[PDB]
Short mmCIF file of N, CA and C in Angstrom, two decimals:
data_model
loop_
_atom_site.label_atom_id
_atom_site.label_comp_id
_atom_site.label_asym_id
_atom_site.label_seq_id
_atom_site.Cartn_x
_atom_site.Cartn_y
_atom_site.Cartn_z
N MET W 1 -1.80 -1.53 -7.59
CA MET W 1 -2.45 -0.34 -8.12
C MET W 1 -3.42 -0.65 -9.24
N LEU W 2 -4.63 -0.61 -8.78
CA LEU W 2 -5.97 -0.77 -9.21
C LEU W 2 -6.19 -1.75 -10.36
N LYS W 3 -7.28 -2.46 -10.09
CA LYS W 3 -7.84 -3.50 -10.93
C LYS W 3 -9.35 -3.21 -11.03
N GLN W 4 -9.95 -3.40 -9.87
CA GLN W 4 -11.38 -3.30 -9.64
C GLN W 4 -11.86 -2.20 -8.70
N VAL W 5 -12.66 -2.63 -7.78
CA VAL W 5 -13.40 -2.35 -6.63
C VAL W 5 -13.65 -3.79 -6.06
N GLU W 6 -13.40 -3.95 -4.82
CA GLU W 6 -13.68 -5.29 -4.23
C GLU W 6 -14.92 -5.10 -3.35
N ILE W 7 -15.89 -5.96 -3.46
CA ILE W 7 -17.12 -5.92 -2.67
C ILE W 7 -17.29 -7.20 -1.87
N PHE W 8 -17.65 -7.04 -0.61
CA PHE W 8 -17.85 -8.19 0.29
C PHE W 8 -19.28 -8.03 0.84
N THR W 9 -20.04 -9.14 0.79
CA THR W 9 -21.42 -9.09 1.28
C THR W 9 -21.82 -10.32 2.07
N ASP W 10 -22.79 -10.04 2.93
CA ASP W 10 -23.50 -11.00 3.77
C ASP W 10 -24.85 -10.34 4.17
N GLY W 11 -25.80 -11.20 4.41
CA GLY W 11 -27.12 -10.78 4.89
C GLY W 11 -27.60 -11.97 5.68
N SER W 12 -28.30 -11.71 6.75
CA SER W 12 -28.80 -12.79 7.60
C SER W 12 -30.01 -12.30 8.41
N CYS W 13 -30.72 -13.29 8.93
CA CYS W 13 -31.93 -13.23 9.70
C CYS W 13 -31.99 -13.99 11.02
N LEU W 14 -32.64 -13.41 12.03
CA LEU W 14 -32.87 -14.05 13.35
C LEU W 14 -34.27 -14.68 13.31
N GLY W 15 -34.32 -15.82 12.68
CA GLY W 15 -35.62 -16.52 12.52
C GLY W 15 -35.93 -16.08 11.07
N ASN W 16 -36.38 -17.04 10.32
CA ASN W 16 -36.66 -16.74 8.87
C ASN W 16 -38.07 -17.30 8.66
N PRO W 17 -39.07 -16.47 8.51
CA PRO W 17 -39.02 -15.00 8.46
C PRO W 17 -38.82 -14.39 9.82
N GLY W 18 -38.10 -13.28 9.87
CA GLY W 18 -37.86 -12.62 11.19
C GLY W 18 -37.06 -11.36 10.85
N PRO W 19 -36.61 -10.67 11.87
CA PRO W 19 -35.80 -9.48 11.63
C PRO W 19 -34.51 -9.92 10.94
N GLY W 20 -34.06 -9.12 9.98
CA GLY W 20 -32.83 -9.42 9.24
C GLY W 20 -31.97 -8.22 9.00
N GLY W 21 -30.75 -8.46 8.53
CA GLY W 21 -29.87 -7.28 8.28
C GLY W 21 -28.92 -7.67 7.18
N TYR W 22 -28.17 -6.71 6.73
CA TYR W 22 -27.13 -7.08 5.69
C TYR W 22 -25.90 -6.32 6.11
N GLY W 23 -24.77 -6.67 5.55
CA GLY W 23 -23.49 -5.97 5.84
C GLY W 23 -22.70 -6.01 4.51
N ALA W 24 -22.18 -4.88 4.08
CA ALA W 24 -21.33 -4.86 2.89
C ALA W 24 -20.11 -3.94 3.05
N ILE W 25 -19.02 -4.36 2.45
CA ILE W 25 -17.76 -3.65 2.41
C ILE W 25 -17.40 -3.43 0.92
N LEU W 26 -17.03 -2.21 0.68
CA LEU W 26 -16.62 -1.72 -0.67
C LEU W 26 -15.25 -1.09 -0.49
N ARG W 27 -14.33 -1.53 -1.33
CA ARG W 27 -12.97 -0.94 -1.24
C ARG W 27 -12.60 -0.24 -2.54
N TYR W 28 -12.76 1.05 -2.49
CA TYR W 28 -12.50 2.00 -3.59
C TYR W 28 -11.01 2.27 -3.63
N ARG W 29 -10.66 3.50 -3.98
CA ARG W 29 -9.22 3.90 -4.04
C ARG W 29 -8.65 4.05 -2.63
N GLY W 30 -7.91 3.01 -2.25
CA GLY W 30 -7.29 2.96 -0.92
C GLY W 30 -8.29 3.28 0.18
N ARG W 31 -9.57 3.28 -0.09
CA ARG W 31 -10.60 3.52 0.94
C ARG W 31 -11.58 2.35 0.93
N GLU W 32 -12.24 2.25 2.08
CA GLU W 32 -13.24 1.16 2.32
C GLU W 32 -14.41 1.79 3.06
N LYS W 33 -15.54 1.50 2.52
CA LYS W 33 -16.85 2.01 2.96
C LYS W 33 -17.68 0.83 3.46
N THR W 34 -18.41 0.94 4.55
CA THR W 34 -19.24 -0.18 5.01
C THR W 34 -20.69 0.27 4.85
N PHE W 35 -21.66 -0.59 4.72
CA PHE W 35 -23.09 -0.33 4.60
C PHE W 35 -23.78 -1.36 5.51
N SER W 36 -24.92 -1.08 6.07
CA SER W 36 -25.56 -2.00 7.02
C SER W 36 -26.95 -1.44 7.33
N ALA W 37 -27.88 -2.32 7.52
CA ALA W 37 -29.25 -1.91 7.85
C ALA W 37 -30.00 -3.17 8.28
N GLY W 38 -30.97 -2.93 9.13
CA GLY W 38 -31.78 -4.08 9.64
C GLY W 38 -33.23 -3.77 9.31
N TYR W 39 -33.93 -4.81 8.97
CA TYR W 39 -35.34 -4.83 8.56
C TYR W 39 -36.17 -5.65 9.57
N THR W 40 -37.29 -5.05 9.90
CA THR W 40 -38.24 -5.55 10.88
C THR W 40 -38.68 -6.98 10.63
N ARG W 41 -38.99 -7.29 9.39
CA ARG W 41 -39.43 -8.65 8.99
C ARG W 41 -39.16 -8.83 7.48
N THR W 42 -38.34 -9.84 7.20
CA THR W 42 -37.91 -10.14 5.81
C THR W 42 -37.46 -11.60 5.80
N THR W 43 -36.69 -11.99 4.81
CA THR W 43 -36.11 -13.34 4.74
C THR W 43 -34.61 -13.32 4.53
N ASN W 44 -34.00 -14.46 4.74
CA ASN W 44 -32.58 -14.73 4.56
C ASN W 44 -32.15 -14.41 3.12
N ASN W 45 -32.90 -15.03 2.23
CA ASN W 45 -32.70 -14.89 0.76
C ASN W 45 -32.68 -13.41 0.33
N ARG W 46 -33.65 -12.69 0.88
CA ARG W 46 -33.79 -11.25 0.55
C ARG W 46 -32.65 -10.48 1.13
N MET W 47 -32.17 -10.84 2.32
CA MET W 47 -31.06 -10.11 2.98
C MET W 47 -29.75 -10.34 2.24
N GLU W 48 -29.45 -11.57 1.81
CA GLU W 48 -28.28 -11.89 1.06
C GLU W 48 -28.25 -11.16 -0.29
N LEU W 49 -29.41 -11.03 -0.94
CA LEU W 49 -29.51 -10.35 -2.23
C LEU W 49 -29.34 -8.83 -2.06
N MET W 50 -30.03 -8.28 -1.09
CA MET W 50 -30.04 -6.84 -0.78
C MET W 50 -28.68 -6.31 -0.48
N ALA W 51 -27.87 -7.08 0.24
CA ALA W 51 -26.47 -6.75 0.56
C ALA W 51 -25.72 -6.47 -0.76
N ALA W 52 -25.87 -7.34 -1.74
CA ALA W 52 -25.15 -7.18 -3.03
C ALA W 52 -25.65 -5.95 -3.78
N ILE W 53 -26.95 -5.77 -3.76
CA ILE W 53 -27.67 -4.65 -4.39
C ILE W 53 -27.24 -3.27 -3.92
N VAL W 54 -27.22 -3.08 -2.64
CA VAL W 54 -26.88 -1.81 -1.99
C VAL W 54 -25.44 -1.41 -2.25
N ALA W 55 -24.55 -2.38 -2.26
CA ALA W 55 -23.10 -2.11 -2.50
C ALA W 55 -22.85 -1.63 -3.93
N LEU W 56 -23.41 -2.34 -4.88
CA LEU W 56 -23.35 -2.10 -6.30
C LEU W 56 -24.11 -0.85 -6.72
N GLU W 57 -25.22 -0.58 -6.02
CA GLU W 57 -25.98 0.63 -6.37
C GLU W 57 -25.25 1.88 -5.90
N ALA W 58 -24.25 1.68 -5.06
CA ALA W 58 -23.40 2.69 -4.46
C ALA W 58 -22.32 3.26 -5.40
N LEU W 59 -21.97 2.54 -6.44
CA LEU W 59 -20.97 2.88 -7.43
C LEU W 59 -21.60 3.85 -8.43
N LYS W 60 -20.86 4.89 -8.74
CA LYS W 60 -21.39 5.89 -9.69
C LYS W 60 -20.50 6.03 -10.92
N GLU W 61 -19.52 5.17 -11.05
CA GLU W 61 -18.64 5.12 -12.23
C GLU W 61 -18.58 3.64 -12.65
N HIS W 62 -18.69 3.38 -13.93
CA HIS W 62 -18.64 1.99 -14.47
C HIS W 62 -17.39 1.33 -13.91
N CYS W 63 -17.52 0.21 -13.25
CA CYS W 63 -16.35 -0.43 -12.63
C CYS W 63 -16.08 -1.84 -13.15
N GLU W 64 -14.90 -2.32 -12.76
CA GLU W 64 -14.51 -3.74 -12.98
C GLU W 64 -14.67 -4.31 -11.55
N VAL W 65 -15.69 -5.09 -11.29
CA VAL W 65 -15.94 -5.49 -9.87
C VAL W 65 -15.65 -6.93 -9.52
N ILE W 66 -15.11 -7.19 -8.36
CA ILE W 66 -14.98 -8.55 -7.80
C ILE W 66 -15.80 -8.58 -6.51
N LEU W 67 -16.89 -9.31 -6.53
CA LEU W 67 -17.87 -9.51 -5.46
C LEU W 67 -17.71 -10.86 -4.76
N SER W 68 -17.31 -10.79 -3.49
CA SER W 68 -17.08 -12.04 -2.74
C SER W 68 -18.17 -12.29 -1.73
N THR W 69 -18.94 -13.38 -1.89
CA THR W 69 -20.05 -13.69 -0.96
C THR W 69 -20.21 -15.18 -0.72
N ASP W 70 -20.85 -15.58 0.37
CA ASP W 70 -21.06 -17.01 0.64
C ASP W 70 -22.49 -17.45 0.45
N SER W 71 -23.32 -16.51 0.02
CA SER W 71 -24.77 -16.77 -0.18
C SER W 71 -24.95 -17.85 -1.23
N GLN W 72 -25.80 -18.80 -0.89
CA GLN W 72 -26.13 -19.95 -1.76
C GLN W 72 -27.15 -19.53 -2.80
N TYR W 73 -27.92 -18.53 -2.38
CA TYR W 73 -29.00 -18.00 -3.16
C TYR W 73 -28.51 -17.24 -4.38
N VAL W 74 -27.60 -16.32 -4.07
CA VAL W 74 -27.08 -15.48 -5.22
C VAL W 74 -26.41 -16.42 -6.19
N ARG W 75 -25.63 -17.34 -5.60
CA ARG W 75 -24.84 -18.32 -6.31
C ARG W 75 -25.67 -19.15 -7.27
N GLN W 76 -26.80 -19.60 -6.77
CA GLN W 76 -27.76 -20.42 -7.49
C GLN W 76 -28.27 -19.71 -8.74
N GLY W 77 -28.74 -18.52 -8.52
CA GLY W 77 -29.30 -17.58 -9.45
C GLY W 77 -28.31 -17.24 -10.54
N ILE W 78 -27.15 -16.80 -10.09
CA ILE W 78 -26.08 -16.46 -11.05
C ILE W 78 -25.63 -17.68 -11.87
N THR W 79 -25.21 -18.76 -11.20
CA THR W 79 -24.72 -19.96 -11.84
C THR W 79 -25.74 -20.64 -12.72
N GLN W 80 -26.97 -20.78 -12.37
CA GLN W 80 -28.11 -21.32 -13.07
C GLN W 80 -28.80 -20.36 -14.03
N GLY W 81 -28.30 -19.17 -14.28
CA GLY W 81 -28.83 -18.15 -15.14
C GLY W 81 -30.27 -17.76 -14.91
N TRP W 82 -30.75 -17.53 -13.73
CA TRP W 82 -32.14 -17.13 -13.42
C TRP W 82 -32.52 -15.94 -14.35
N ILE W 83 -31.89 -14.86 -14.04
CA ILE W 83 -32.03 -13.55 -14.72
C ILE W 83 -32.18 -13.70 -16.21
N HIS W 84 -31.25 -14.39 -16.83
CA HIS W 84 -31.35 -14.58 -18.30
C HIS W 84 -32.69 -15.22 -18.64
N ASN W 85 -32.99 -16.31 -18.03
CA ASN W 85 -34.23 -17.10 -18.16
C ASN W 85 -35.49 -16.23 -18.02
N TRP W 86 -35.65 -15.57 -16.90
CA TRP W 86 -36.73 -14.65 -16.55
C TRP W 86 -36.95 -13.48 -17.49
N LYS W 87 -35.87 -12.78 -17.83
CA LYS W 87 -35.93 -11.59 -18.65
C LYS W 87 -36.56 -11.90 -20.01
N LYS W 88 -36.31 -13.13 -20.45
CA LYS W 88 -36.84 -13.52 -21.78
C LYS W 88 -38.34 -13.73 -21.61
N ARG W 89 -38.71 -14.29 -20.46
CA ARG W 89 -40.14 -14.58 -20.17
C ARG W 89 -40.85 -13.51 -19.38
N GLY W 90 -40.49 -12.27 -19.42
CA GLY W 90 -41.13 -11.15 -18.75
C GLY W 90 -41.19 -11.23 -17.27
N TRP W 91 -40.27 -11.99 -16.68
CA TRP W 91 -40.15 -12.18 -15.23
C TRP W 91 -41.26 -12.93 -14.55
N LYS W 92 -41.91 -13.82 -15.26
CA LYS W 92 -43.01 -14.64 -14.73
C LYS W 92 -42.60 -16.09 -14.85
N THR W 93 -43.13 -16.90 -13.98
CA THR W 93 -42.86 -18.36 -14.01
C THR W 93 -43.75 -18.99 -15.06
N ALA W 94 -43.57 -20.30 -15.22
CA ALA W 94 -44.36 -21.01 -16.24
C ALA W 94 -45.84 -20.83 -16.04
N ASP W 95 -46.28 -20.65 -14.82
CA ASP W 95 -47.72 -20.55 -14.55
C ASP W 95 -48.15 -19.11 -14.38
N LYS W 96 -47.41 -18.27 -15.07
CA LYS W 96 -47.64 -16.85 -15.19
C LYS W 96 -47.67 -16.04 -13.92
N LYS W 97 -47.07 -16.47 -12.84
CA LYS W 97 -47.01 -15.62 -11.64
C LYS W 97 -45.62 -14.92 -11.70
N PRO W 98 -45.55 -13.78 -11.07
CA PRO W 98 -44.28 -13.05 -10.99
C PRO W 98 -43.28 -13.92 -10.24
N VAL W 99 -42.03 -13.98 -10.72
CA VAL W 99 -41.02 -14.76 -9.97
C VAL W 99 -40.90 -14.14 -8.57
N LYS W 100 -40.46 -15.00 -7.67
CA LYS W 100 -40.18 -14.72 -6.25
C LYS W 100 -38.95 -13.79 -6.19
N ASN W 101 -39.14 -12.77 -5.41
CA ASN W 101 -38.23 -11.66 -5.15
C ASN W 101 -37.89 -10.92 -6.45
N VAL W 102 -38.90 -10.80 -7.31
CA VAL W 102 -38.67 -10.10 -8.59
C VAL W 102 -38.18 -8.68 -8.33
N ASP W 103 -38.60 -8.04 -7.26
CA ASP W 103 -38.15 -6.63 -7.03
C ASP W 103 -36.64 -6.52 -6.91
N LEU W 104 -36.01 -7.39 -6.17
CA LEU W 104 -34.57 -7.47 -5.92
C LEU W 104 -33.78 -7.99 -7.13
N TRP W 105 -34.24 -9.08 -7.71
CA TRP W 105 -33.58 -9.66 -8.90
C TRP W 105 -33.45 -8.65 -10.03
N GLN W 106 -34.48 -7.82 -10.25
CA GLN W 106 -34.45 -6.75 -11.25
C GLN W 106 -33.40 -5.68 -10.93
N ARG W 107 -33.40 -5.31 -9.65
CA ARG W 107 -32.43 -4.26 -9.20
C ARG W 107 -31.02 -4.75 -9.43
N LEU W 108 -30.83 -6.05 -9.18
CA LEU W 108 -29.58 -6.73 -9.40
C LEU W 108 -29.21 -6.74 -10.90
N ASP W 109 -30.08 -7.31 -11.70
CA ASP W 109 -29.91 -7.30 -13.15
C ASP W 109 -29.44 -5.92 -13.67
N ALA W 110 -30.09 -4.87 -13.22
CA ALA W 110 -29.83 -3.47 -13.62
C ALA W 110 -28.42 -3.03 -13.27
N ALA W 111 -27.90 -3.49 -12.15
CA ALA W 111 -26.53 -3.19 -11.70
C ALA W 111 -25.47 -3.90 -12.53
N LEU W 112 -25.76 -5.15 -12.83
CA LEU W 112 -24.91 -6.04 -13.62
C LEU W 112 -24.61 -5.54 -15.03
N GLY W 113 -25.57 -4.82 -15.62
CA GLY W 113 -25.37 -4.30 -17.01
C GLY W 113 -24.52 -3.05 -16.95
N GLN W 114 -24.27 -2.60 -15.72
CA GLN W 114 -23.47 -1.38 -15.54
C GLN W 114 -21.98 -1.71 -15.43
N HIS W 115 -21.68 -2.66 -14.57
CA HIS W 115 -20.32 -3.08 -14.24
C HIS W 115 -19.94 -4.43 -14.80
N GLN W 116 -18.66 -4.65 -14.89
CA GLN W 116 -18.12 -5.96 -15.36
C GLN W 116 -17.88 -6.67 -14.04
N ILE W 117 -18.66 -7.68 -13.75
CA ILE W 117 -18.55 -8.36 -12.43
C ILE W 117 -17.96 -9.76 -12.52
N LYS W 118 -17.14 -10.02 -11.52
CA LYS W 118 -16.41 -11.24 -11.26
C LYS W 118 -16.81 -11.67 -9.84
N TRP W 119 -17.57 -12.74 -9.82
CA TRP W 119 -18.13 -13.33 -8.61
C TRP W 119 -17.11 -14.26 -7.96
N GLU W 120 -17.08 -14.23 -6.65
CA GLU W 120 -16.16 -15.09 -5.89
C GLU W 120 -16.99 -15.75 -4.80
N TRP W 121 -17.17 -17.04 -4.93
CA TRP W 121 -17.97 -17.78 -3.95
C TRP W 121 -17.06 -18.37 -2.88
N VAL W 122 -17.32 -17.92 -1.67
CA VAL W 122 -16.60 -18.32 -0.47
C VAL W 122 -17.41 -19.30 0.36
N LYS W 123 -16.68 -20.11 1.11
CA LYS W 123 -17.24 -21.13 2.00
C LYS W 123 -16.45 -21.16 3.31
N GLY W 124 -17.05 -20.55 4.33
CA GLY W 124 -16.42 -20.49 5.66
C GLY W 124 -15.70 -19.18 5.86
N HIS W 125 -15.75 -18.66 7.07
CA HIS W 125 -15.11 -17.41 7.42
C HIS W 125 -13.60 -17.56 7.55
N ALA W 126 -13.19 -18.80 7.59
CA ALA W 126 -11.79 -19.20 7.74
C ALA W 126 -11.02 -18.73 6.49
N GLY W 127 -10.26 -17.69 6.78
CA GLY W 127 -9.38 -17.01 5.86
C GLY W 127 -10.18 -16.08 4.95
N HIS W 128 -11.21 -15.54 5.55
CA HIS W 128 -12.07 -14.58 4.84
C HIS W 128 -12.57 -13.62 5.88
N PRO W 129 -11.77 -12.66 6.29
CA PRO W 129 -12.12 -11.73 7.39
C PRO W 129 -13.12 -10.67 7.04
N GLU W 130 -13.05 -10.15 5.83
CA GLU W 130 -14.04 -9.18 5.31
C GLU W 130 -15.43 -9.80 5.25
N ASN W 131 -15.50 -11.08 4.98
CA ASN W 131 -16.81 -11.80 5.00
C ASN W 131 -17.21 -12.02 6.48
N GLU W 132 -16.21 -12.40 7.30
CA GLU W 132 -16.54 -12.57 8.74
C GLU W 132 -17.20 -11.25 9.20
N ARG W 133 -16.58 -10.13 8.85
CA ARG W 133 -17.03 -8.80 9.19
C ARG W 133 -18.46 -8.46 8.79
N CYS W 134 -18.78 -8.75 7.55
CA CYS W 134 -20.15 -8.51 7.02
C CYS W 134 -21.16 -9.27 7.88
N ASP W 135 -20.79 -10.49 8.30
CA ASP W 135 -21.72 -11.30 9.11
C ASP W 135 -21.95 -10.61 10.45
N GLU W 136 -20.85 -10.12 11.02
CA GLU W 136 -20.94 -9.45 12.32
C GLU W 136 -21.81 -8.22 12.19
N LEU W 137 -21.62 -7.55 11.06
CA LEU W 137 -22.33 -6.31 10.73
C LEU W 137 -23.82 -6.59 10.52
N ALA W 138 -24.04 -7.66 9.77
CA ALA W 138 -25.35 -8.15 9.39
C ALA W 138 -26.17 -8.54 10.61
N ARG W 139 -25.63 -9.34 11.50
CA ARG W 139 -26.34 -9.82 12.67
C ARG W 139 -26.60 -8.71 13.67
N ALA W 140 -25.74 -7.71 13.64
CA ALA W 140 -25.85 -6.54 14.53
C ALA W 140 -27.00 -5.67 14.07
N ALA W 141 -27.04 -5.34 12.80
CA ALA W 141 -28.18 -4.56 12.26
C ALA W 141 -29.53 -5.21 12.53
N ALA W 142 -29.65 -6.49 12.30
CA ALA W 142 -30.86 -7.31 12.45
C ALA W 142 -31.50 -7.19 13.83
N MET W 143 -30.69 -6.84 14.82
CA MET W 143 -30.99 -6.64 16.20
C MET W 143 -31.63 -5.26 16.43
N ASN W 144 -31.47 -4.37 15.49
CA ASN W 144 -32.01 -2.98 15.66
C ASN W 144 -32.60 -2.52 14.33
N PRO W 145 -33.67 -3.21 13.98
CA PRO W 145 -34.30 -2.95 12.69
C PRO W 145 -34.89 -1.57 12.64
N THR W 146 -34.60 -0.88 11.55
CA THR W 146 -35.15 0.48 11.40
C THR W 146 -36.01 0.60 10.15
N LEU W 147 -35.90 -0.37 9.28
CA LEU W 147 -36.64 -0.38 8.01
C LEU W 147 -37.61 -1.54 7.90
N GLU W 148 -38.53 -1.28 6.98
CA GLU W 148 -39.60 -2.17 6.57
C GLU W 148 -39.16 -2.63 5.19
N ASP W 149 -39.25 -3.92 4.98
CA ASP W 149 -38.85 -4.49 3.66
C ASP W 149 -40.22 -4.62 2.94
N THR W 150 -40.54 -3.61 2.17
CA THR W 150 -41.83 -3.54 1.47
C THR W 150 -42.14 -4.64 0.50
N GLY W 151 -41.18 -5.13 -0.26
CA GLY W 151 -41.37 -6.20 -1.26
C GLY W 151 -41.50 -7.55 -0.58
N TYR W 152 -41.41 -7.50 0.76
CA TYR W 152 -41.54 -8.78 1.48
C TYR W 152 -43.03 -9.17 1.51
N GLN W 153 -43.27 -10.21 0.74
CA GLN W 153 -44.60 -10.81 0.60
C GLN W 153 -44.65 -11.97 1.62
N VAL W 154 -45.78 -12.00 2.29
CA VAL W 154 -46.06 -12.98 3.35
C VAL W 154 -46.37 -14.35 2.75
N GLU W 155 -47.40 -14.37 1.97
CA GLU W 155 -48.04 -15.43 1.28
C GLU W 155 -47.24 -16.67 0.91
N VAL W 156 -47.00 -16.75 -0.39
CA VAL W 156 -46.24 -17.83 -1.03
C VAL W 156 -44.75 -17.40 -0.88
#
């Protein structure tokens, strides 16, 4: 009887860049909510980040959160303190260009100041069924894209 909210995320793509989707599970008070959507053209990195974003943006009461994901990207960012680094430098790289996926990283940062988050980095679906599920959810959405990922820049 209650600690957190547990969040499970995955996002993936069929060809990168290519159609992608995300899958998230949120377990509130004895209830569990799923989220899923597919995008016409985006990236892997963006799908993994978006999954975390959508789940967290879904909470409307300050929570104690445990977020379990296998994304290398989120992991990198969080562990290497991207956000902290960027925020001090106005979200631009050393050569004054906007950091890559600044739209998503900001949305993430904004969620993090709301909740007390405890990250759980998983490796392999083996003994992680909620993560297995998000992947199934993620790959399914990617197959029937209904959205356009606007912040998806072609270029660099």
